[PDB]
Amino acid sequence: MDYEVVHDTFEVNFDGWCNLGVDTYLTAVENEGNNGTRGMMVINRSSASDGAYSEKGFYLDGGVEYKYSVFVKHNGTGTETFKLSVSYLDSETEEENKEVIATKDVVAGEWTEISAKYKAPKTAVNITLSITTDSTVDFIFDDVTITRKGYAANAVLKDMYANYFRVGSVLNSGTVNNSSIKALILREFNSITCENEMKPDATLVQSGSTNTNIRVSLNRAASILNFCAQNNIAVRGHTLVWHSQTPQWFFKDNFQDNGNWVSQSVMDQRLESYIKNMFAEIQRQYPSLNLYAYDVVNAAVSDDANRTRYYGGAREPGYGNGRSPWVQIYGDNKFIEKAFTYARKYAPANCKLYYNDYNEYWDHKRDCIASICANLYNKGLLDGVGMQSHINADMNGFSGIQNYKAALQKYINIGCDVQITELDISTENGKFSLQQQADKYKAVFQAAVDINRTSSKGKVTAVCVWGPNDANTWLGSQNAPLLFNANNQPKPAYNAVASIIPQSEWGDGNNPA
Ligand SMILES: O[C@@H]1[C@@H](O)[C@H](O[C@@H]2CO[C@@H](O[C@@H]3CO[C@@H](O)[C@H](O)[C@H]3O)[C@H](O)[C@H]2O)OC[C@H]1O
Numbered sequence: 099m100d101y102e103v104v105h106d107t108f109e110v111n112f113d114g115w116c117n118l119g120v121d122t123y124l125t126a127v128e129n130e131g132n133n134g135t136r137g138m139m140v141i142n143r144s145s146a147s148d149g150a151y152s153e154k155g156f157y158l159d160g161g162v163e164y165k166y167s168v169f170v171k172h173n174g175t176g177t178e179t180f181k182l183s184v185s186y187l188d189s190e191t192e193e194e195n196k197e198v199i200a201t202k203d204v205v206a207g208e209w210t211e212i213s214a215k216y217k218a219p220k221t222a223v224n225i226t227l228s229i230t231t232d233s234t235v236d237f238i239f240d241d242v243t244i245t246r247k248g249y250a251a252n253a254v255l256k257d258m259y260a261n262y263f264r265v266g267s268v269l270n271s272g273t274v275n276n277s278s279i280k281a282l283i284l285r286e287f288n289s290i291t292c293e294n295e296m297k298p299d300a301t302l303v304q305s306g307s308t309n310t311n312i313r314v315s316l317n318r319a320a321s322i323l324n325f326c327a328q329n330n331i332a333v334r335g336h337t338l339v340w341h342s343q344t345p346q347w348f349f350k351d352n353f354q355d356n357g358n359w360v361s362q363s364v365m366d367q368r369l370e371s372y373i374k375n376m377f378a379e380i381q382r383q384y385p386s387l388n389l390y391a392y393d394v395v396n397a398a399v400s401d402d403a404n405r406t407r408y409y410g411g412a413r414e415p416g417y418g419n420g421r422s423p424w425v426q427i428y429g430d431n432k433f434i435e436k437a438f439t440y441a442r443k444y445a446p447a448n449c450k451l452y453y454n455d456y457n458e459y460w461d462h463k464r465d466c467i468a469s470i471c472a473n474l475y476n477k478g479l480l481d482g483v484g485m486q487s488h489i490n491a492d493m494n495g496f497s498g499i500q501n502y503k504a505a506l507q508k509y510i511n512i513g514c515d516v517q518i519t520e521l522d523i524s525t526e527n528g529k530f531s532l533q534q535q536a537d538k539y540k541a542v543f544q545a546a547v548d549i550n551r552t553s554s555k556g557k558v559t560a561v562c563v564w565g566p567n568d569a570n571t572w573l574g575s576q577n578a579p580l581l582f583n584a585n586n587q588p589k590p591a592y593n594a595v596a597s598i599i600p601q602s603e604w605g606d607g608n609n610p611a
């Protein structure tokens with residue numbers, strides 16, 4: 099058992115560990131760790147199955163044997179039976195099986211090692227270590243260890259663009275288990291956004307929320323944040339307010355999907371609380387994470403010209419289908435400035451606040467987004483406009499290079515920054531070739547680089563692609579819309595984008611400027 103694949107020694111961050119059981123609480127405390135170090139306390143359990151867990155899919159493969167080892171300590175009376183358990187999901191049967199791998203009776207007051215060798219089936223993905231007891235006893239663990247068993251800049255995006263902006267991609271619960279993508283991200287990208295795991299419905303906790311204390315959870319995001327903090331990859335938060343992927347109950351008097359719409363002043367409380375508590379938890383659990391940007395409000399301007407003309411861009415009130423529960427409560431887009439105010443209040447200083455939207459180069463919508471953002475920038479509330487940049491491969495037309503530069507320029511002319519937040523470039527089911535997609539990718543990065551070489555005030559501080567490869571895109575792979583194919587081989591677009599910056603100007607991707 100040579101290689102060490104995991105070593106969690108909670109000195110800085112929670113290292114990807116979550117509370118098992120909706121009411122269990124994890125708290126990392128100084129000096130309560132093994133050897134006087136920082137340790138991880140698990141409290142408030144209410145059944146032998148409650149406890150703590152960590153998805154380690156990033157680090158553990160199916161069909162491989164590992165030695166799993168954790169030091170634990172409890173402060174009760176007599177012996178406690180500790181259990182280490184491993185869970186996976188069978189990529190065939192789609193069932194979660196959890197087998198207890200080590201059972202060990204542990205005396206009070208003493209740091210003890212619990213460990214065993216375990217080899218999960220060849221078809222196991224999402225391998226998850228969890229610690230529990232045979233009682234509902236409180237405990238503390240430290241020094242989790244899993245083992246087996248067998249500046250010159252590189253030609254990589256983050257290094258090539260180190261003097262210009264971060265270069266981002268996206269991770270999700272599924273891709274976080276893909277070894278091959280882990281290697282890709284580490285090699286190329288210095289920014290990650292969670293595709294879904296930081297949205298309101300992935301983070302809000304219904305049980306026990308109240309108007310002035312909305313409970314939140316990073317359990318869905320934790321392996322990602324952990325992976326990013328551990329490897330010095332910056333993260334964009336996505337997203338605090340959005341008419342989509344937000345539970346209806348969040349908007350209802352009794353925290354139930356079918357309650358009554360709440361008043362504006364009730365919803366102010368809940369809005370502020372969600373925002374305060376999201377920032378508090380990120381700080382609490384991943385203080386070393388470079389949370390460089392956050393999408394405070396997402397996609398609030400309507401695609402409908404009638405609404406941008408006569409209703410300040412408000413979507414239609416309601417829930418689902420592009421309707422907005424925010425407009426349902428507030429009547430209006432006034433909630434936007436509210437969200438940025440609370441975000442300015444609780445975000446770290448280095449965390450830049452973005453209004454993010456798509457079809458951002460369509461005149462009537464562009465004009466409305468630019469106006470909203472300029473008013474916010476001027477009040478000190480907003481730092482940047484996010485251009486989602488869900489575009490196609492056509493140099494001409496609705497998202498062609500002209501419309502796109504015009505929008506990039508009008509955003510930059512506000513004085514704020516710009517980020518290109520969710521870039522993908524659809525071939526429209528093969529209507530456009532990979533060679534034309536390469537041209538559009540080259541045009542877009544080239545336009546960002548040009549802004550940065552020109553002026554001044556405004557900059558493009560990130561360019562991010564909405565996915566790591568063509569096997570993992572929300573547009574479906576028939577639109578092959580990213581820089582790497584389904585085997586992570588670089589496409590023509592990658593070659594193209596890698597050819598814009600001369601070797602002399604490359605810098606340190608881990609310390610971009
Ligand atoms: O059924 C749910 C899926 O539909 C959901 O898929 C995600 C939908 O949101 C996508 O990302 C957005 C794309 O558009 C921009 O306007 C937004 O700012 C982005 O958030 C995301 O890529 C999809 O994966 O997730 C899984 C299901 O529960």
Ligand SMILES: [Ca+2]
Nearest residue numbers: 107131135136
């Ligand atoms: Ca420790």
